């Protein structure tokens, strides 16, 4: 029974129950809007609890290959590693893909399964429909053919990382030859090098590789292709890179944190802002450990200790 048998063995449920559940599974999604940070809203499709558990079990059962250049949605790796990969360089070529998650269709997934250069788990032809129903979301009730990955789902990140495995491999191989390091936080192609005038040809390589692999399904966002140098601001996925080639939160965010700590010093900070400040300080300690020491020196050690609390 293959996939359904393993899902039943993991969920401790009968095959009939799971099979009946996986009939309108591409449709069992709750969609909502979250507020954008400046203005507008973002639409997210989140599956139901049962489908979420099914997707988690399917993800843990089958291990799809991922590349080392990818930095999103893996254990032990995240924003700090992605920023530190290009920390010591001089020039960067942050680029983005156009509608990355909703451009992935079951056709793309099955095309990537067969031609993957690394090991790929064997899916029987009988269970491919169940795979499509488990992994993919179906917007528009009337259209049963439109199946896309939903940004935000227990299974979408790993599928998205796997679908770009060949792209990541080929891009990394091309970039290492020309002394360019490449990382991708699942939508942010980051290229950096110390050689001048070497990043100009990278976007054309990206376009031709995307056309070769995904055809017209995946495209670059030309408005999101940015060239930066030490003469201008340099930040990778939220972490500023200094002219001293070290990670930083940015001067503005550091001054904001300083103002928050000063407000806490005179007791003008409420509980919500206090919790936000504690979270920001933990994130800063993760990203910029020296900032915590500087704040301890500036605002005394006892004030900081009382602010972060004790165990």
């Amino acid at each position: 029974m293959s996939v359904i048998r393993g899902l039943a063995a993991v969920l401790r449920q009968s095959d009939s129950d799971i099979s009946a559940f996986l009939v309108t599974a591409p449709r069992k999604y709750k969609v909502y809007k979250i507020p954008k940070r400046t203005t507008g809203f973002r639409v997210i499709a989140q599956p139901a609890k049962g489908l979420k558990d099914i997707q988690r079990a399917f993800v843990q059962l089958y291990s799809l290959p991922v590349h080392d250049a990818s930095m999103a949605y893996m254990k032990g790796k995240g924003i700090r590693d992605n920023a530190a990969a290009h920390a010591g360089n001089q020039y960067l070529l942050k680029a983005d893909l156009e509608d990355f998650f909703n451009s992935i269709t079951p056709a793309i997934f099955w095309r990537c399964i067969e031609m993957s250069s690394a090991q790929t788990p064997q899916f029987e032809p009988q269970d491919k429909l169940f795979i499509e129903k488990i992994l993919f979301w179906q917007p528009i009730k009337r259209r049963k053919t439109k199946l896309i990955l939903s940004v935000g789902a227990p299974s979408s990140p790993v599928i998205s990382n796997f679908c770009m495995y060949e792209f990541d491999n080929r891009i990394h191989a091309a970039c290492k030859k020309v002394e360019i390091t490449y990382t991708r936080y699942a939508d942010d192609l980051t290229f950096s090098s110390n050689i001048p005038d070497v990043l100009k040809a990278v976007p054309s390589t990206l376009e031709v590789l995307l056309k070769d692999l995904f055809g017209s399904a995946l495209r670059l966002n030309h408005s999101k292709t940015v060239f930066s140098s030490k003469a201008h601001n340099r930040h990778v996925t939220g972490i500023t890179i200094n002219n001293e080639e070290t990670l930083s939160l940015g001067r503005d965010r550091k001054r904001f944190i300083k103002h928050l700590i000063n407000q806490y010093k005179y007791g003008l900070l409420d509980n919500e802002d206090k919790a936000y400040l504690i979270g920001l300080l933990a994130f800063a300690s993760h990203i910029e450990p020296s900032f915590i020491t500087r704040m301890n020196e500036k605002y005394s050690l006892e004030l900081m200790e009382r602010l972060r609390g004790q165990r």
């Binding site: 408005s223 802002d273 936000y276």
Partner: protein, 236 residues
């Protein structure tokens, strides 16, 4: 949420301040007076702040100009980028190189700003599906991406005009929402309290037409202020 918008607005962001002002105004009159609020004053100061420099010219605190223009499969350009200057940009070349095309694309982009200043959610001009797309092409669609600068509070206003060729099953859409948001800010702040509005004009080859005052031109009372946006990007 209100807390995040307040944190961003007190830092100088204009979009967050306008969002806070709108959410206060549309609420009960306890927090919404349509004006005389912190966020409305922040927005109007952001729009209206300036100082007279050493030469006697008023310089606004937050200048407005176009930063980048990208032309993808537009007329003769497969993919072109420009780095428009803050004060004066000159485009030179032989005949049939695309300078008029660049000006035409910029005017089409500015038409959305003009329309949404005049009219809420107004529709600007769109790329032609018969002539604007490159004849050779590979996907039979064209994109015109623009980024605008409106001070440190609004460092980027990305607007993209897209059109697909005739007889294409897949039609490409335009991303014009940020221009609508900025023009909504301008229009709402102006109606609540008069502010200085930007000028968008195009003077193409359609100028130099003969004669003047051809007809009485019953067209909308030239005296009223918003008559300055009428046919402003028409070319003549």
């Amino acid at each position: 949420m209100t807390k995040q918008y307040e944190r961003k607005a007190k830092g100088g962001n204009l979009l967050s301040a306008f969002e806070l002002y709108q959410r206060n105004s549309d609420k009960a009159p306890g927090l919404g007076e349509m004006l005389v609020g912190e966020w409305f004053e922040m927005c109007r100061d952001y729009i209206q702040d300036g100082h007279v420099d050493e030469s006697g010219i008023f310089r606004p605190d937050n200048a407005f100009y176009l930063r980048r223009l990208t032309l993808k499969d537009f007329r003769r350009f497969s993919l072109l980028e420009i780095k428009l200057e803050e004060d004066l940009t000159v485009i030179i070349g032989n005949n049939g190189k695309g300078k008029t095309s660049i000006l035409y694309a910029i005017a089409k982009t500015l038409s959305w700003f003009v329309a949404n200043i005049l009219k809420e959610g107004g529709s600007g001009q769109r790329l032609s599906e018969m002539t604007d797309i490159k004849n050779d092409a590979e996907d039979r669609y064209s994109d015109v991406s623009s980024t605008f600068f409106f001070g440190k509070g609004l460092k980027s206003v990305p607007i993209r005009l897209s059109r697909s060729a005739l007889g294409t099953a897949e039609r490409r859409d335009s991303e014009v929402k940020p221009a609508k948001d900025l023009a909504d800010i301008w229009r709402v702040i102006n109606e609540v309290n008069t502010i200085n509005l930007p000028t968008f004009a195009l003077y193409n080859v359609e100028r130099s037409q003969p004669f003047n005052r051809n007809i009485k031109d019953n067209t909308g009372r030239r005296e009223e202020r918003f008559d300055a946006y009428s046919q402003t990007l028409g070319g003549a």
